[PDB]
Amino acid sequence: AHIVKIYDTCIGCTQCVRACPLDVLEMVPWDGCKASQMASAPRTEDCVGCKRCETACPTDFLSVRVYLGSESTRSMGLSY
Amino acid sequence: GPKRGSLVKILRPESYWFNQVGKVVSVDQSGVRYPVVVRFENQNYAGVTTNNYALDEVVAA
Amino acid sequence: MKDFTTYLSTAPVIATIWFTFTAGLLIEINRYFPDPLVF
Amino acid sequence: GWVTFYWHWKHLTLWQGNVAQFDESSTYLMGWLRDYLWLNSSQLINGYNPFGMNSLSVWAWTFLFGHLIYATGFMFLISWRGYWQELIETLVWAHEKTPLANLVYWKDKPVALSIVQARLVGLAHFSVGYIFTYAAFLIASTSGRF
Amino acid sequence: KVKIAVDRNPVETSFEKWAKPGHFSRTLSKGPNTTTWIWNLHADAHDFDSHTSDLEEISRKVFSAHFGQLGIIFIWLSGMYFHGARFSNYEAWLSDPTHIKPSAQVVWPIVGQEILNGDVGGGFQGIQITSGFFQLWRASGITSELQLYTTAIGGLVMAAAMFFAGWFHYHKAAPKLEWFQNVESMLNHHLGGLLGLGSLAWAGHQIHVSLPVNKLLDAGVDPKEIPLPHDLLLNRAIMADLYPSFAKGIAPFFTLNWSEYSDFLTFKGGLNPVTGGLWLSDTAHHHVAIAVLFLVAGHMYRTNWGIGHSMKEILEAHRGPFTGEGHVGLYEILTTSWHAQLAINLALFGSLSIIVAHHMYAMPPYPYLATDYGTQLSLFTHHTWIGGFCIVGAGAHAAIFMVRDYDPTNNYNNLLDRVIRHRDAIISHLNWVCIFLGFHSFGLYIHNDTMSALGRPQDMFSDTAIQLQPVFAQWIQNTHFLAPQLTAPNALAATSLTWGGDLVAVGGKVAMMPISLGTSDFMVHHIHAFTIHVTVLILLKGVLFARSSRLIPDKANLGFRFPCDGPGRGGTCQVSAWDHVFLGLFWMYNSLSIVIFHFSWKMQSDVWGTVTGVSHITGGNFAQSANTINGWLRDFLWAQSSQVIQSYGSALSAYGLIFLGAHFVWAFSLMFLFSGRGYWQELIESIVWAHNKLKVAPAIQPRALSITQGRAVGVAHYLLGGIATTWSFFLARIISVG
Amino acid sequence: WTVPTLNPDTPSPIFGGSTGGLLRKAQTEEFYVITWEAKKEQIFEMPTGGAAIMRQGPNLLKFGKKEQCLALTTQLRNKFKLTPCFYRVFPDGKVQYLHPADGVYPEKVNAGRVGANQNMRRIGQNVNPIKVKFSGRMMSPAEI
Amino acid sequence: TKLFPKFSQGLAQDPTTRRIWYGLAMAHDFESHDGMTEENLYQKIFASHFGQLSIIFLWTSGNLFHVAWQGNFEQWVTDPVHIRPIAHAIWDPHFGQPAVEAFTRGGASGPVNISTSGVYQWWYTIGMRTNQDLYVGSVFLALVS
Numbered sequence A: 001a002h003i004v005k006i007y008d009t010c011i012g013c014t015q016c017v018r019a020c021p022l023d024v025l026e027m028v029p030w031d032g033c034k035a036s037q038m039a040s041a042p043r044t045e046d047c048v049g050c051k052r053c054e055t056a057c058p059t060d061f062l063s064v065r066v067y068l069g070s071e072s073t074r075s076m077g078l079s080y
Numbered sequence B: 001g002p003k004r005g006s007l008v009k010i011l012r013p014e015s016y017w018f019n020q021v022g023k024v025v026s027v028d029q030s031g032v033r034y035p036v037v038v039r040f041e042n043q044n045y046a047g048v049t050t051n052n053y054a055l056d057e058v059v060a061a
Numbered sequence C: 001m002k003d004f005t006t007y008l009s010t011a012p013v014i015a016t017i018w019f020t021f022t023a024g025l026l027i028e029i030n031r032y033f034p035d036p037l038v039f
Numbered sequence D: 001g002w003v004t005f006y007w008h009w010k011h012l013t014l015w016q017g018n019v020a021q022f023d024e025s026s027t028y029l030m031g032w033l034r035d036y037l038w039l040n041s042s043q044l045i046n047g048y049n050p051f052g053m054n055s056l057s058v059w060a061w062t063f064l065f066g067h068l069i070y071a072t073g074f075m076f077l078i079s080w081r082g083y084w085q086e087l088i089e090t091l092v093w094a095h096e097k098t099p100l101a102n103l104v105y106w107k108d109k110p111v112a113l114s115i116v117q118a119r120l121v122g123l124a125h126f127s128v129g130y131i132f133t134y135a136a137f138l139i140a141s142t143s144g145r146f
Numbered sequence E: 001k002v003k004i005a006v007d008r009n010p011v012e013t014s015f016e017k018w019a020k021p022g023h024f025s026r027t028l029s030k031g032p033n034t035t036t037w038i039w040n041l042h043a044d045a046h047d048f049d050s051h052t053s054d055l056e057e058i059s060r061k062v063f064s065a066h067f068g069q070l071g072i073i074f075i076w077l078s079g080m081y082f083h084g085a086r087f088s089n090y091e092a093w094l095s096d097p098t099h100i101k102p103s104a105q106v107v108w109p110i111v112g113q114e115i116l117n118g119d120v121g122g123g124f125q126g127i128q129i130t131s132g133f134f135q136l137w138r139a140s141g142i143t144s145e146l147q148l149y150t151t152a153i154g155g156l157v158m159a160a161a162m163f164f165a166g167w168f169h170y171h172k173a174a175p176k177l178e179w180f181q182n183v184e185s186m187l188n189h190h191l192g193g194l195l196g197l198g199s200l201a202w203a204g205h206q207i208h209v210s211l212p213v214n215k216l217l218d219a220g221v222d223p224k225e226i227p228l229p230h231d232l233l234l235n236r237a238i239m240a241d242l243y244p245s246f247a248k249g250i251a252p253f254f255t256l257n258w259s260e261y262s263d264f265l266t267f268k269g270g271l272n273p274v275t276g277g278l279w280l281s282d283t284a285h286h287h288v289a290i291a292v293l294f295l296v297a298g299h300m301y302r303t304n305w306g307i308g309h310s311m312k313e314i315l316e317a318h319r320g321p322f323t324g325e326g327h328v329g330l331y332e333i334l335t336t337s338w339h340a341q342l343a344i345n346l347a348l349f350g351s352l353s354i355i356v357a358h359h360m361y362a363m364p365p366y367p368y369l370a371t372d373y374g375t376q377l378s379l380f381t382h383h384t385w386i387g388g389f390c391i392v393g394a395g396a397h398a399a400i401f402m403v404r405d406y407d408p409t410n411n412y413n414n415l416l417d418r419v420i421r422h423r424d425a426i427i428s429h430l431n432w433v434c435i436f437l438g439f440h441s442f443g444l445y446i447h448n449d450t451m452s453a454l455g456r457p458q459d460m461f462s463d464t465a466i467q468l469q470p471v472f473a474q475w476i477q478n479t480h481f482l483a484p485q486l487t488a489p490n491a492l493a494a495t496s497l498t499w500g501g502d503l504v505a506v507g508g509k510v511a512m513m514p515i516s517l518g519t520s521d522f523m524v525h526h527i528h529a530f531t532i533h534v535t536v537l538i539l540l541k542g543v544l545f546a547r548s549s550r551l552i553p554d555k556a557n558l559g560f561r562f563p564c565d566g567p568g569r570g571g572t573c574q575v576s577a578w579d580h581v582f583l584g585l586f587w588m589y590n591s592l593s594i595v596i597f598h599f600s601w602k603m604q605s606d607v608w609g610t611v612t613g614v615s616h617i618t619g620g621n622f623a624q625s626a627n628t629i630n631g632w633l634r635d636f637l638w639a640q641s642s643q644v645i646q647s648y649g650s651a652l653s654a655y656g657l658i659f660l661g662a663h664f665v666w667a668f669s670l671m672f673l674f675s676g677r678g679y680w681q682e683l684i685e686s687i688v689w690a691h692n693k694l695k696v697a698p699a700i701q702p703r704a705l706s707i708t709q710g711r712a713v714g715v716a717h718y719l720l721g722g723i724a725t726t727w728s729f730f731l732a733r734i735i736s737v738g
Numbered sequence F: 001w002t003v004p005t006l007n008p009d010t011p012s013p014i015f016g017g018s019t020g021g022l023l024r025k026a027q028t029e030e031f032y033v034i035t036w037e038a039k040k041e042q043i044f045e046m047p048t049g050g051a052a053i054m055r056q057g058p059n060l061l062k063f064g065k066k067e068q069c070l071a072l073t074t075q076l077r078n079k080f081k082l083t084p085c086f087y088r089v090f091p092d093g094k095v096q097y098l099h100p101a102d103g104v105y106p107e108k109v110n111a112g113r114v115g116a117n118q119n120m121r122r123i124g125q126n127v128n129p130i131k132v133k134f135s136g137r138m139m140s141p142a143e144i
Numbered sequence G: 001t002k003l004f005p006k007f008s009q010g011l012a013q014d015p016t017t018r019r020i021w022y023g024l025a026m027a028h029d030f031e032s033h034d035g036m037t038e039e040n041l042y043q044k045i046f047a048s049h050f051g052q053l054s055i056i057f058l059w060t061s062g063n064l065f066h067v068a069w070q071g072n073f074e075q076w077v078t079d080p081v082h083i084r085p086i087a088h089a090i091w092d093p094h095f096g097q098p099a100v101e102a103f104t105r106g107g108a109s110g111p112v113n114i115s116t117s118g119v120y121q122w123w124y125t126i127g128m129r130t131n132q133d134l135y136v137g138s139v140f141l142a143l144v145s
C-alpha cells in the first residue's frame, strides 16, 4: 500500500477525509488544534495514490502526505 | 503574543512566506501550539493568504 | 465616458499604441535615410 | 549535431577546392541547407531506384529506417498513460469475453507503462533514429563522392 | 399556436463593465494576483454555459454573436472587392486572360520588399493571386471596375447593418425562449424562403445578365463594347436576337409549351470548348430545378394550421423491435441544448466542404478556370483543410454536450442508452478493423521498398509485377461514360471528361482528360480509409468515455477539461475528452496532409501539361514512383523542392523565407509538447530571486502555464508550422512550373 | 449502531445489463458487493454506465473494485440523503463490512477511532536520506 | 509470487508486467539491493570492472581476427591509396544477383563491406604487415580476456 503520514499541523478540517475516494482516512478526537480533531489514516491498503487529499489539506506546509509503494491485486485498483 | 493587527516577520524555513513579513490577525490566549494567525497579500502556490504559526517562528518586524 | 477612457488605458491597447508608434518611427527613418551602416 | 555538421561541411569544401563556396554559402542558413544537404543528398536517394541499385542502396535504406525509428518514438514522447490504459482495459474485456479465447490465461497482468518508463523508451527511440539517419547520410556522401 | 414574442431594454448600453474586466464571471471579477489569471480570462470569455445557466440568456448572447460574425464576413468581402477594383490588372486580364496573370496585392517601395512586385503581364507588377475572383467575376459579368467599386461600398454598408442589428436584438428588443424554440417554423422558413428564393433569383440573374454577356465574350467581341445590363433588361429586341424565344415574352411558358424555351435552357453536358467551363444555360436550368425543389420542400411542417407534420410525432413513430423505446426524447434533447445542434451541424458542414472541393475540381464551372493549375490546387487543398477542422470540432462539442447537459432520467431505454451499454464491444471491433487495415496497407509499401532495394523488383507491387486493380472504380467510370446512350437518352454527353472520352484543351493547355487508375491509386485509397477509421476511433472513444470509465468512474463531475487525476493507480495523465480531441486533431492533420499530397502528385504527373500530343509536367513518373517510399521521397518531394529552394533574388524569395520560418516554428512547438511545468516554475522562482534582489519583482506573481495550457500551445504551434511549410512549398512550386 | 448483515437475497434494481459486468476475478482472488434501501422507487444512473431504476426499499448490487461502490455511495448520499453500506466478499465468501463499520461515516468525528498513522511533528523535521541508507529494502526518512 | 526481480521481493510479488519491466530496469543499482553491505558493494564493483575489461579485450581481439581472416591487408600495405579495406564477409540468402554483384565489387571475389575504422592505417603504421601476425595478436588478446 502507498504510504501516508499525518502531521501535528493536522487542523482537523477534514478536507482530507472530505476528499479521499477510498476511505483511507477518518477523523479522531484530538487536542492540539481547536477543532480537537486530527485526521487519521487507518486503511492504507485501499489508497491508490490519487492524491486528492494532498490536494486538499490547507496547512501551509501541507499536513498529511502520501508516498508511493509496491502493488498487488488489492492495491492498484485494476478491475481485472 | 503581540496585539492583533501587528506586523511580524515569518521565519519558518518550509513556509512559503519564509523570510517575509505578514500581518498578525490574532493570537490565541490559550495554549494551542500555533496561536499566531498571519494574513498576507501574496497567495502561495495554492491560493492562500493567511497562515498559522507558533510563537518563535515569527519576529514582529 | 471616464469608464471608456479607462478601458483605453487598459494594457493591450496601450501596448499596441506604443508599438505602432515605435514601428512607424523606424519605418519613416529608414525611408528618409535609406540603408545606413556606419557612424 | 551542430559542431559535427560544421566540421563536415568545411572539410568537404577543403577536399574539393571551392572553399570560397564555404566562406560564402556558410554565412546564411539557406545556403547551408540547400548547398550542403539537398545538394549532397542527391546520390543517397539514388542508392537505388526503379532502375536498379548500387553500393549505396543499403545506406539509403538505413537513412529511411532511422527516419522511421524517429517518427515512431515521437508517439512515445507525446502520448501519455491514462489514454492507453483505458484502451488496454477495453481490449482485455474483449480478449476474455470473446468465446474460445478466454481458454488461455496469461500470468503477468497487462497495464500501460509507468510515466518514467515511457519517457525513457521514447528518448531511446528518438536518439536511435537520429544517430542512424545522420551517420548513413554522412558516410554515403563522403564515400560515394570520394 | 405560434407567433412573435419579445422583451424590451433587457441590458443597457454603457462602458461601466467595460471598465470592469472579467465582469462576466463573479470568480474572475475579483481581481488578478497571478499570471494564469490572464490566460483564464482570455480562455473562458465565450464559455456561455459556464457564465450563467439561463437558456434565454445564452440564447440572446449567441444570436448577437452570430451577427458579429456576419458583419466581419461582410467587411472582409468588401475589402476583397475594393482591392480588386483599385489595385488590380483585372481589366487587362479581361482583355486577355490566357497570358495576363491576376494580380491585386501590391507592395510598397521600401527597404527592399519591392522586389516582390512580379511582372504578371498586362504591363502590371505585383503578386499573383490564386483565389480566382477574376474567373468568377468574368463568369458573372463584371466589366467596369466601377462595378467592383460600388460592390465594395455596398458590402461595407451591409457589414454596418449587421453590427447594428446585433446591438439592437441584444440590448433593446430581445426575443424569448419559445420564439427560439419554434423549430418547425424555422425549418419551413429556411428551406422555403432562403434556399428556394436564392436559387430562383440566381436563375434570374444568370438568365438576364450573365448568360448574354458571356455568350458575347466567348463570341470574342470587345469587352467594353458589350452593352450594359440595364440595356439588356430594357430592350427585349436584343435578347430576342440572342435567343429567338425572348421575343414571345412569357406567354409560351404560361401555355406549358416549355420545350420552346430550350434555346437557353439546355442539357448539353460536357464543357464549353472556348473557356473550359460548364455550359451556362445548363447551370441556369440546374439552378431552376434546385429552386423549385427547395421551395416545394419549404411547405412541409405544420405551423398554425393542421396541415403539415409534427417532428416529435414523426420521431416517436419510428421504433424498432431490436431497439426498445427508439427515438423518444430526441426532440427534447435537440429543442434544449445548443451543443447537440453544433455537433451535428459541424459534422455535416465539414463533410460538405470536402465534397465541394472534389466536385469543383471534377467539373470546372468557370471560364478559363482549368488553366491556372495553381488556382485549382490552392482552392482544393484549402477547402479540404477547412473541412477536416470543422469535422474535428463537431466531435469536440459532441463530447462536451455529452459530459455537460445529458440527462439519464429522460432516456431510460434509449438508443442512446443501449449504445452507451455496448460501447465496449463497439470500440473493440473498431480497434481491430483499424489495426487490420494499418497492417495490410502500410506493410504493402514496406514490402515494395524492401523488394526494390534488395534487388528483386520482380516481386514488388505495381502495374508491372504482381498487380492490384481498382476494378470497381474502372467499372463505374466505364458505366458513367456509356450512360447517356440508354440511361439518360436526353443527355448529350458525360457530366465529366473523367468518365472517359476526348481531351479538351485551351491556350495550348489541357483542361481535362480521362483519368487512369492504377495499383498505386488502389493502395493510396486504402491508406486514406485506414487513417480515416483511426481518427474516427479516437473521437468515438473520446465521446463514449465522457461521463465515466472502467478506470475513472466519476469522470463526469470532473468537467470536460482537466490535466489528469494525479499519478494515482499508476499515473493518469491525459484522460480527459479534451485530450481526446487533442490527439484526434493530430491525426486529422496527418490524414489531410497525405490526401492532398496524393491529389497534387496525381494531377501534376498525369493530367497537367501542354498539348503539342500532351506533355505531362512530370511526364507520368507517378504510376511507377508512387508505390515505394524511397521513390516517393526522392522523385516527388526531393525533386519538386527545387524551385522553392532556389526562389531567391526573385519575387518568389518570400516563399522560401516562409518555408524556413515554418520549419522553425514547427520544431519550436516540440519544447512545449515535451516539457513539464514543474521545471518551468522552479526556473521562474530562481529568476524571481534574481529580479527581486534588485527590488524589481513584479506585483503580478509569475506562474508557469497550466498543464492543459502547455498542451494546447504545443499543438497550435506544431500544426501551424506543418501546414505553413506545405503551403509555401505548394505555392512556390506550382507557380514556378505553371 | 450495530454491524449490518449482508442478506444475499435482496431485490436487485431494474437494469438491462451492461458491459461492466462479471469477470473471473470473483473466482480468482476477490470481489465486492454493496447494499442499501430506498425511500421511494426511482430511476438513477449506473456508475459503470447505463440507466437503472432503484426499487422502493432495499436494493443490492455487485461491483468488482471498491471505488465504484464509493461513487454510488456518494451519489445516493448526496442526491436523496440516502445511506448505504457495503461488503468486501472474499474468494471463499468471507463477508467483511467495508461500509458503516464505525457506525458513523468519518465526515463527522467519533470517539473510538484511534488516531492512526500520525506524527506529532512537522515535516521539515525529517532526517537526511544519507542516514537511512543500508537497508534490505529502500526506506524513506519520512517514515522515521 | 514468482521470483522475477529477485533482489526486489516486493516486485517479485507484483502480479503485473511492471514486475518484469522494473526488475530489468534496476538490475545494477546495487545501492538499492537486498541486504546491501559496504564490503559487499565493493567486491561487486570489483567483479564488474573485471567484466568490463574482459568485454573490451574480446572486442579488440574480434576485430583483429575478422580482419586477419577476411581483409585485404597484405595487399593494402603495398598501395595505401587505391586499395580500400575490406570489413567482413557479407552473407545473406535474400540478396539477389544485382546486390551480390554490386556488393562483390569493392573488395575481392565476394560481397564485402568497406571498413572505415582506421585500424588498417593504425596497425600497418605500428609495424603490422602479415596476416600471421594479426592472428597472433588476436589469439593473445583472447588469452588475456
Ligand SMILES: CC1=C(C/C=C(\C)CCC[C@H](C)CCC[C@H](C)CCCC(C)C)C(=O)c2ccccc2C1=O
Residues within 6 Å of the ligand: D075, D076, D079, D080, D081, D084, D111, D112, D113, D114, D115, D118
Ligand atoms: C503506445 C503507448 C503505450 C502502450 C504500449 C505498451 C504498453 C507496450 C507495448 C509493447 C509491445 C506489445 C511490444 C514491445 C516491443 C519492443 C521492441 C520490446 C523490446 C524488448 C527488449 C527486451 C529488447 C503505453 O503504455 C504508454 C504509456 C505512457 C505514455 C505513452 C504510452 C504509449 O504511447
Ligand SMILES: CC1=C(C/C=C(\C)CCC[C@H](C)CCC[C@H](C)CCCC(C)C)C(=O)c2ccccc2C1=O
Residues within 6 Å of the ligand: E671, E672, E673, E675, E676, E677, E680, E703, E704, E705, E706, E707, E709, E710, E711
Ligand atoms: C516553455 C514552457 C513554459 C514556459 C513558458 C511560459 C511561462 C510562457 C511565457 C509567455 C511570455 C513569453 C511571457 C509573458 C508575455 C506577456 C505579454 C507579458 C508582457 C511581456 C512584454 C515583453 C511585452 C511553460 O510554462 C510550460 C508549461 C507547460 C508545458 C510546457 C511549458 C513550456 O514548454
Ligand code: SF4
Residues within 6 Å of the ligand: A004, A019, A020, A021, A022, A023, A024, A025, A046, A047, A048, A049, A050, A051, A052, A053, A054, A066
Ligand atoms: S492518496 Fe490521498 S486522496 Fe488518494 S486515497 Fe490516499 S489520502 Fe485519499
Ligand code: SF4
Residues within 6 Å of the ligand: A009, A010, A011, A012, A013, A014, A015, A016, A017, A038, A039, A056, A057, A058, A059, A062, A063, A064
Ligand atoms: S490534514 Fe488538512 S484536510 Fe486533513 S484533517 Fe488536517 S487540516 Fe483537515
Ligand code: SF4
Residues within 6 Å of the ligand: D115, E563, E564, E565, E566, E567, E571, E572, E573, E574, E707
Ligand atoms: S502533473 Fe502530469 S505527470 Fe503529474 S499527475 Fe498530472 S498529468 Fe500526471
